[PDB]
RNA sequence: GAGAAUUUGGACAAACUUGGUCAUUUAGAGGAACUAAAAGUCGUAACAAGGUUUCCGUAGGUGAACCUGCGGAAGGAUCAU
RNA sequence: GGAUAGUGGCCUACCAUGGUUUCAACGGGUAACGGGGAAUAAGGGUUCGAUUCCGGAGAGGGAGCCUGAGAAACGGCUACCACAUCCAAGGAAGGCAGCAGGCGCGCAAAUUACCCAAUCCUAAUUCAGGGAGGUAGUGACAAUAAAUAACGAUACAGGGCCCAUUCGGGUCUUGUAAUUGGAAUGAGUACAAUGUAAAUACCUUAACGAGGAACAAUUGGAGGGCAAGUCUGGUGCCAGCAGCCGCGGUAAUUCCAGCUCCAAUAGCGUAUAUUAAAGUUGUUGCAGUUAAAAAGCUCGUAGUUGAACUUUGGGCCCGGUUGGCCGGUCGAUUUUCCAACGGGGCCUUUCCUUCUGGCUAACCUUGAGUCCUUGUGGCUCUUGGCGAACCAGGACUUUUACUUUGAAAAAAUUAGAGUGUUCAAAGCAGGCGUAUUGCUCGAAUAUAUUAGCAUGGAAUAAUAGAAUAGGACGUUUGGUUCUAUUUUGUUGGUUUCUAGGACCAUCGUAAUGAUUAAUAGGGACGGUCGGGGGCAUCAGUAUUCAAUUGUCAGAGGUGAAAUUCUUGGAUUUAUUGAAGACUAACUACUGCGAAAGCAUUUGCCAAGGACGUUUUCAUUAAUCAAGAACGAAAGUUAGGGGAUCGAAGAUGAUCAGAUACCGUCGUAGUCUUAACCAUAAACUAUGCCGACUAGGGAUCGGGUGGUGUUUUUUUAAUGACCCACUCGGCACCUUACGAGAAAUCAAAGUCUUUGGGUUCUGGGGGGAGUAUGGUCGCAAGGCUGAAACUUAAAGGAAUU
RNA sequence: GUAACUAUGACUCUCUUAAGGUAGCCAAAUGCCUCGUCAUCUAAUUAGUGACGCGCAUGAAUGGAUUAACGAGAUUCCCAC
């Protein structure tokens, strides 16, 4: 009837060291402490990133769905890693272009895949300074 | 309990409530002390003398009759052995198993129980060192127990 | 070895009062046990108890009235301060009206109600609802 | 009397070369992998006694699952003389 | 010793060998300057703090140094390294992590503005200076307040009511109307004055400024979670949406649109961190038989934890709050009849160790006594001694944790008191009179649970004290080394006396004295008890082979066969002999052992539990990082041995193939000696020590009983076996109130009514028990052991 | 010879007699083509080294693959000279 853990009044060392060890099994803690955000993670553990679009891509959706997901492969200005970002509305692949500048952001799932889209963890929000929403709703026009 | 096994035996001696002598006993402290001392002169130990007095005579317990324990009486008369009983007999049992171990070298049940006897000697020693019944610098190694018992 | 004696005494009283028995036998019986039983007795969670004086730690035979629901020990005797008694009597007891948390105070073994009226504190022993 | 360059040794000590040792970053012809993805080829190993009960440790063999030996376990298909 | 302003291995010389560390030294990392604080909000916490205050550091990187009270200064100098300028080619000048501004870097941040007027600072100093600092500009980082409309009349409706005479008279109200008409205000805009250093903006204001198309409010959504469409047009597994489950494949409430509708609203969404949610880090407070997880098992240091017992009593007065009969009274307050709470004195053997002076107010007492209705009513005052009003010196205290109260705890922040900044976030102002000379309340308080300092308590927890007494106490009495003021007329000396140190030698005084046997453990002892251990012996068939012997056509082996041997008699029969394994039947819900394991016999050597015990020691204990011993099988070395069986391999079947399952052979393989290895579904998939909660057998020990059986040597002394009752421990099993997701259970119960001690392990599934690095090993491998990336489930139990 | 796919590990037959070179290793002192191809060493390398292998004509006591130390052995590079 001891409940495993020590219950001495002089056991604060053990009770603290046991948490210090067993905290590593937590997901949030481990990656905040080992700094996984700053080694892996193309964004280098930041909110957004900028990049120049290499190719237009047609990624095939995962099996229960069927579509062409109109992604864009983009080299990150920040570090030089090449990632694949999704273009976030109907006829926006025709808006972005090849060789243009792009503001990326996470896909709202913190380093995982959003739905059926295989191996896309990022999303285009702006092209050449002007947002991919305003051009879509026909509010702002691309520069030059 | 039984620290060196899974044994849980409760075999013991429930000493009588009477804190005074048995009402049927005569020849008080004087004669019994003389019989204790002359038994210790013959070379028997407090653990044997308490038995001999319970068996052959009417000495139910030594401390209730006299007001003095048996080895406390031997230390009063300066007729106490060099090392106490507990350690003496445990050392004797460690020498017993070890003197057979060197002949019969695959007795891994003997080697196991040798470690048990030896690691019980060491726990006694640490106690008898703390309470100063034994001098410090005292430790049983091997081939020196041969000197301790004889 | 048995690490505490108040522990198994209070447990034994609880295990009996679970089944609605009218008496318990406590084997070890310390002065601390007797003093805890006396504080239980005062508020009326306990009837009378005999102390059989076998030339040893002795034993107790307590008599219950089926009023006591919960009766436990806090094993590690936490150094409580009167600034934080409310944090204990809010975490251990049913709300506020009844029940008592038992402190081994310097003035002696008492409840939180009594320790407040005196304006003194010590450690924690246990509780009774 | 003042007193400049100059220079005699001292400690302070940058900086230079020279190897050393540790850390981080990183190129590499080839080699041996692992995951994923439509399932495309080959069988059908497992789930029923899955058609050889399954599984563990270990040892060997084999296109592939796997197969076989030894010891063990029922989470067995027996809670039985 | 030197040096320093000074202390110091700070430095020098000469010596000694020290110092830190499993209570984590040292080494590595920090996308680390510390703190006051910040976000979240049951409590406990978690995360962060470059940044308005305090401290530390640095001025591209190191080092050096002058001047000075102050610097190892950088808007000072010197050198070197880096980078950089202008050059007339000889030289010269550099240091924005001060303000502004430019590059660059990026997801990511403002004006090369005005001023000393406020806050202050500096100076020879009322004046000068100040990119300190303020003012305006940029400025949806945050924060406060709150416009985007309000009101009737006119036509329709509905909803309470008289009788529902069908009446509705609608006599009141809740709205609907592209009908309608006057009143309102800033949003702007601008004379003005105010503001200000000067201005801008606010505050206040001339004149102008509202009518649906405006002075136009968005942002994200409508299948579920989740408030809100089973409404139209388009697309047709595409385009797409979709945090997640999912929607779209020709009628989509999910796509793109229209129309309605919803949530928040001058904001709303989006991405990434973080807090709650999260009892998914659990101290409060997790989970571990089967869902992830008891570390194969025992020993063991550190660590954590550790039974009981020492003053309990019973009284013998006085004083604090709060309700008490009440108002004892003027809807503001005190008395008893009378309690509760928290206390000091005093003794019941109880002692805060008590001294020398000052202080003793004081009667334990009287120096004359007596102011006086007959009074043990009351003091002008003081012999002998009180001490407890009262220290400041003595001067020794067996020590801690714990808790009480207090002290100093910066401000800002936080909580919070007061106050109409028009309200509020704020601010620390204000308030009220003749408002002519005025007066006046404020700027409180509280937490800062660490450490240090004082303070009271002495319940819980530990430590020592008297054991070869070197124990305690004194009107005991003796010698020593002492020191030491006072008078020896003046200090100085020999021996003094006297006081106070400490030391033994005696004398006494004490209760002539002095420490509990844990249904905790260790050990001894007694008769047992086991298929526990080892070493040597003894046996039994069997299996294979061999020698001989008798028979004359098959035998094997199969679901069926074939390889296989056989007439030179195979298989079968018998008499033997050999070799190496193996311990059948008895053999069990039975035993022993730390686990692995251990079943022929006898002998030897040691051990071990259990029981019994009016023996002994007396806390010696529980669990345990590190560190160790044993550890099936297989496997590896090298020697024997190799009968049987059999990985590999040979080979016959089956097969579609089947280098497998079935058949016949068959190396290695261990069974053995020495040395390794150290893993198993090493399992009861249930850590150990400890306590409590509820029928039958059976192992071992002991206690009673039976005039039971056997017992013969006369009746039997018994003894054993057996029977009944009884316990202690054991391996269990059968029924069940509590527990668990259930299967289920003697613990998996005593668990949101959560705490006996303690060790180990787990945090979705994969990747993966993989890589790497150490470590061990002859090798095979063992121990420790990640991440990238991937995924919405995988899994446990029960139901149909 | 057929076969996923774009180079094929599943089928099929006939065997040079008996077996079809297994584990290994290599342009090796054994590779004709050959100065093989790829990397590396150099400014430049028919050389050296490390890999690749349908190897004219490698290979298991005619021993194969390693291998510390040793060598007046054959070879390549570097520093000193």
**How far is residue B48's CA from residue B39's CA, in Å, rounded to a whole number?**
9
| Contact indicator for A86, A122 with CB cutoff of 8 Å | yes
Q: How was this structure determined?
A: cryo-EM
**How far is residue C103's CA from residue C86's CA, in Å, rounded to a whole number?**
13
In this structure, the number of other CB atoms found within 10 A of the CB of residue A72 comes to: 28
**How far is residue B52's CA from residue B59's CA, in Å, rounded to a whole number?**
9
For chain C, the residues before each gap (C–N > 2.5 Å) are none
**How far is residue B33's CA from residue B45's CA, in Å, rounded to a whole number?**
14
| Contact indicator for C39, C113 with CB cutoff of 8 Å | no
Burial of B60 (0-12, 13-18, 19+ CB in 10 A): middle
Phi, psi of C17 (to 5 degrees): -70, -20
Neighbours of chain B (3+ CB pairs under 8 A): C
User: How do strand C59-62 and strand C49-52 relate by DSSP bridges?
Assistant: antiparallel
**How far is residue B3's CA from residue C67's CA, in Å, rounded to a whole number?**
42
Give helix then strand counts, H and E, for chain C. Answer: 4, 7
Specify the length of chain A in residues: 144
Query: Which residue's entry shows tokens 């009766």?
Result: C71
| Contact indicator for B134, B90 with CB cutoff of 8 Å | no
**How far is residue C55's CA from residue A109's CA, in Å, rounded to a whole number?**
73
- Nucleotides on chain E that have an atom closer than 7 A to a protein CB are 23, 31, 42-44, 47-48, 105-108, 220, 237-249, 255-256, 270-275, 280-284, 286-288, 294, 298-301, 303-310, 341-343, 402-405, 448-449, 456-461, 468, 515-525, 532-535, 593-596, 605-623, 629-631, 674, 687-694, 728-730, 749-751, 753-764, 787-792
In this structure, the number of other CB atoms found within 10 A of the CB of residue B110 comes to: 14
Sign (positive or negative) of CA dihedral C107, C109, C114, C120:
positive
Burial of A104 (0-12, 13-18, 19+ CB in 10 A): buried
Distances (CA, A) of B81 to A68, B10, B92, B121, C91: 97, 30, 14, 17, 60
Burial of B94 (0-12, 13-18, 19+ CB in 10 A): buried
**Contact: chain C with chain A (3+ CB pairs below 8 Å):** yes
Specify the length of chain C in residues: 129
């Amino acid at each position: 009837m001891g409940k495993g853990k020590p219950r001495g009044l002089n056991s604060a060392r053990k009770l603290r060291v046991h948490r210090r060890n067993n905290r590593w099994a937590e997901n949030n803690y481990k990656k905040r402490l080992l700094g996984t955000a700053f080694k892996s993670s193309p964004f280098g553990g930041s909110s957004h990133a900028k990049g120049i679009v290499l190719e237009k891509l047609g990624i095939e959706s995962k099996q229960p769905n069927s579509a062409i997901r109109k992604c864009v492969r983009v080299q990150l200005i920040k570090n030089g890693k090449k990632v694949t970002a999704f273009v976030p509305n109907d006829g926006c692949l025709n808006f972005v272009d090849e060789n243009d500048e792009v503001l990326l952001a996470g896909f709202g799932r913190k380093g995982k895949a959003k739905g059926d889209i295989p191996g896309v963890r990022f999303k285009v929000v702006k092209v050449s300074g002007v947002s991919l929403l305003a051009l879509w709703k026909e509010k702002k026009e691309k520069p030059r | 309990g039984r620290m060196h096994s899974a044994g849980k035996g409760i075999s013991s001696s429930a000493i009588p409530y009477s804190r005074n002598a048995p009402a049927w006993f005569k020849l008080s402290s004087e004669s019994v002390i003389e019989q204790i001392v002359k038994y210790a002169r013959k070379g028997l130990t407090p653990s044997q003398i308490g038995v001999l007095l319970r068996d052959a005579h009417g000495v139910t317990q030594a401390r209730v009759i006299t007001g003095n324990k048996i080895m406390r009486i031997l230390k009063s008369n300066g007729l106490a052995p060099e090392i106490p009983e507990d350690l003496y007999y445990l050392i004797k049992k460690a020498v017993s198993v070890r003197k057979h171990l060197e002949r019969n070298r695959k007795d891994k049940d003997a080697k196991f129980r040798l470690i048990l006897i030896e690691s019980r000697i060491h726990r006694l020693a640490r106690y008898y060192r703390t309470v100063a019944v034994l001098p410090p610098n005292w430790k049983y190694e091997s081939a020196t127990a041969s000197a301790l018992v004889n | 070895t048995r690490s505490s004696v108040l522990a198994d005494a209070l447990n034994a009283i609880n295990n009996a009062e679970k089944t609605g028995k009218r008496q318990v036998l406590i084997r070890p019986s310390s002065k601390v046990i007797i003093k805890f039983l006396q504080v239980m007795q005062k508020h009326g969670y306990i009837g009378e108890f005999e102390y059989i004086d076998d030339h040893r730690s002795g034993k107790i035979v307590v008599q219950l009235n089926g009023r006591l629901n919960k009766c436990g020990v806090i094993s590690p005797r936490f150094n409580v301060k009167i600034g934080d008694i409310e944090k204990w009597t809010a975490n251990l007891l049913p709300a506020r009206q009844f029940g008592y948390v038992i402190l081994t105070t310097s003035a002696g073994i008492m409840d939180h109600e009594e320790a407040r009226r005196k304006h003194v504190s010590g450690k924690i022993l246990g509780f009774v609802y």
